[PDB]
Amino acid sequence: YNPSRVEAFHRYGTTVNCIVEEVDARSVYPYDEFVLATGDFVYMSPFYGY
Amino acid sequence: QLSRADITTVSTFIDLNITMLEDHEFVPLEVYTRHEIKDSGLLDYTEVQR
Ligand SMILES: *[C@@H]1O[C@H](CO)[C@@H](O)[C@H](O)[C@H]1NC(C)=O
C-alpha cells in the first residue's frame, strides 16, 4: 500500500503483512542456540523449558 | 672315550635363512584435518552472522 496521489506533497503509507512460515532449525554442540532456515540466529537452547 | 664335539664337524645341509615380516603399526595421518580446511576460508557465514 502507498498513499493516494496529492500534488507537491509528501505522504506516508503503512503496510502490515502478517507472515507465518515453516522453517528447518539447526543447532550444534553444546546446543545452547539454534539458527533458522532464514539465517536468523536464536540465542536460546532448543530444549529450554520449565 | 671322546666327546662328540672333539671331532671337526662340517654342515652337510644347505642353510636357508627365513626372516618373517615384522609387524607394522599404521598411525593416523592427514595433510589437512577437516577443521583446517574449514578454517582455510577467509570468512565464515556462520560466525559472521552469529
Ligand atoms: C642365516 O643364514 C645364513 C646363511 O644365509 C647362515 O650362515 C646363518 O647361520 C643363519 N642364521 C643366522 C643367525 O645368521
* Structure obtained using: cryo-EM
Question: For residue A18, how far is its CA from the centre of ligand 1 (angstroms)?
Answer: 91
* Region of residue A39 (phi > 0: left; psi between -120 and 50: alpha; otherwise: beta): left
DSSP B36: H
CB A47 within 8 A of CB A31: yes
Q: Does B35 touch chain A (CB under 8 A)?
A: no
Q: In angstroms, rounded to a whole number, what is the distance separating the alpha carbons of residues B37 and B43?
A: 12
Which atom of ligand 1 lies nearest, measured to the CA of B15?
4
Question: Is B49 an 8 Å CB contact of chain A?
Answer: yes
Whether the CB-CB separation of A25 and A17 falls below 8 Å is answered with no
Instruction: Report the 3 state secondary structure along A14-49.
Output: CCCCCCCCCCCCEECCCCCCEECCCCCEECCCCCCC
Residue whose CA lies nearest to ligand 1 atom number 5: B17
Q: Locate cell 576460508: which residue?
A: B41
- How far, in Å, is the centroid of ligand 1 from the Cα of B2? 29
